[PDB]
Amino acid sequence: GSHSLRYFYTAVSRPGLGEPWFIIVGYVDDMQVLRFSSKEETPRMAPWLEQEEADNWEQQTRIVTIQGQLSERNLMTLVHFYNKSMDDSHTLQWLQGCDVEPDRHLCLWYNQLAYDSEDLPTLNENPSSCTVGNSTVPHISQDLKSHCSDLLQKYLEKGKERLLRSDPPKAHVTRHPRPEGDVTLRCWALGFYPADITLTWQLNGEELTQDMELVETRPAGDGTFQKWAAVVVPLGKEQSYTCHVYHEGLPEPLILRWGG
Amino acid sequence: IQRTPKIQVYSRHPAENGKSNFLNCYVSGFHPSDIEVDLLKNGERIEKVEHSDLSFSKDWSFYLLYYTEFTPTEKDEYACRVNHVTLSQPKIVKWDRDM
C-alpha cells in the first residue's frame, strides 16, 4: 500500500562560459511524472495524467522553478566552500521526496545531497518525518517537505490507471548451444511493472550462484521493464535445471521448466 | 570521481522481422553526466533518435535510455555507440536478437 514520490535534481556548472545547466525529474514509484530543466517556462508533466482543467500544480511549479533558479548560487558556494578549480565542471545532485502509506499515518521524508559524486553530510536524521494532516495549503509553501505527502496523493489520484498498476512478468527460457562444450539457459522476464523483481536458477532444488549471469533490469521504454538470468549446463541436462521468478504482480512465484 | 558507463542494446518487444518495434540503447552507472550516444544501422548514425530525461541511481551515478522506432530484417545489423570521458576510445556494442 506504500507509495513514494521522488525528485531527482542535477546541476552542472559550465567552465566559465555561461550559466549552469540543470534538470529536475520527478518520479512516483517507477513511473516518471514530471520534468523541469534549464529553459522551460513551466514543468512538463506526464501526458497520461488527467491534465489541467484548472489543476492546482502551483505549489509544485513554484517549488521546482525556485530550486532550479537557485542552482547557480548553490553551485558557487560549494565551489567556494571547497575551493575547487573553477576551471573544472562540477555537478550537484540532490534527492528529495517521501514514502507514504496513509493507513499507518506513515510519512517518511528524504533529503540527500552530493557534490561531484561525494555525499554531503546530513546529521539531520536520514529519513525524517513528514505529515498527513491535509485540508489547507498554507502560506509556508517554500518548503517541499510540508507538501510531499499531498503532492503524492494528487499524482495517485490523477494516474490511478498507470500508477496503481501491477503487470506481472511474462517468462520463457531460451536454449543456446555453446559450441564450447556446454549449453546456456536464459530465463526471461518481460513487461513486468514495478522494476523490483528477482530471478534465480535452481539445480536439483538449490539456488545457483557464482556460475550465473545477471543484467541490471532495464526499461523497455514502453513503461515496463525487462530482465533475464542465465546459466551454463551440460548437454541434455536441460530439464534438470529450473528457473524461478518472484514478483509483485505474480499470484504465486512463477517456476519455469525448459521451454516446455 | 568518475565512472565508466554500462551499456545494453535490445529491442522493446521480441525481435520479429517486418514487424514494427523499438531499438533501445541503455546507459547507466556512469558519472559525469556528459555522454554521447548514437544508434547505428549498418554503421550509420541513425536520424531520429530520442532519449529519456537524465536521472541518477542510489550511488549517484546517472542513466539514460536512447531509443528509436524501427523495423528489423534478417539482414540489417544494428549497434550502439557510446562516448564518455572515461573512455580511451568510443565503445560500440552490437545488437543481438538473443541477448
UniProtKB/Swiss-Prot annotation, chain B:
Record function comment: Component of the class I major histocompatibility complex (MHC). Involved in the presentation of peptide antigens to the immune system. Exogenously applied M.tuberculosis EsxA or EsxA-EsxB (or EsxA expressed in host) binds B2M and decreases its export to the cell surface (total protein levels do not change), probably leading to defects in class I antigen presentation.
Similarity annotation: Belongs to the beta-2-microglobulin family.
Compartments it resides in: Secreted; Cell surface
GO process terms (BP): amyloid fibril formation; antigen processing and presentation of endogenous peptide antigen via MHC class I; antigen processing and presentation of exogenous peptide antigen via MHC class II; antigen processing and presentation of exogenous protein antigen via MHC class Ib, TAP-dependent; cellular response to iron ion; cellular response to iron(III) ion; cellular response to nicotine; intracellular iron ion homeostasis
Entry's Gene Ontology molecular function annotations: identical protein binding; MHC class II protein complex binding; peptide antigen binding; protein homodimerization activity; structural molecule activity
GO CC annotation, single: membrane
Taxonomic placement: Eukaryota, Metazoa, Chordata, Craniata, Vertebrata
Post-translational modification: Glycation of Ile-1 is observed in long-term hemodialysis patients.
Predominant subcellular localization, coarse grouping: secreted
Disease tied to this entry: Immunodeficiency 43: A disorder characterized by marked reduction in serum concentrations of immunoglobulins and albumin, and hypoproteinemia due to hypercatabolism. Patients may suffer from recurrent respiratory tract infections and severe skin disease.
Residues recorded with modification Pyrrolidone carboxylic acid: 2
Protein name from the UniProt record: Beta-2-microglobulin
Disulfide bonds: 25-80
Residue ranges constituting the Ig-like C1-type domain according to the UniProt record: 5-93
UniProt keyword annotations, A-Z: Amyloid, Amyloidosis, Disease variant, Disulfide bond, Glycation, Glycoprotein, Immunity, Immunoglobulin domain, MHC I, Pyrrolidone carboxylic acid, Secreted, Signal
Portion of the parent chain present: 21 to 119 of 119
Subunit structure: Heterodimer of an alpha chain and a beta chain. Beta-2-microglobulin is the beta-chain of major histocompatibility complex class I molecules. Polymers of beta 2-microglobulin can be found in tissues from patients on long-term hemodialysis. B2M alone (not in complex with HLA-I) interacts with M.tuberculosis EsxA (ESAT-6) and an EsxA-EsxB (CFP-10) complex; the tripartite complex can be detected in the host endoplasmic reticulum. The B2M-EsxA complex can be detected in patients with pleural tuberculosis and is stable from pH 4.0 to 8.0 and in the presence of 2M NaCl.
Species in which this protein is naturally found: Homo sapiens (Human)
Glycosylation sites: 1, 19, 41, 48, 58, 91, 94
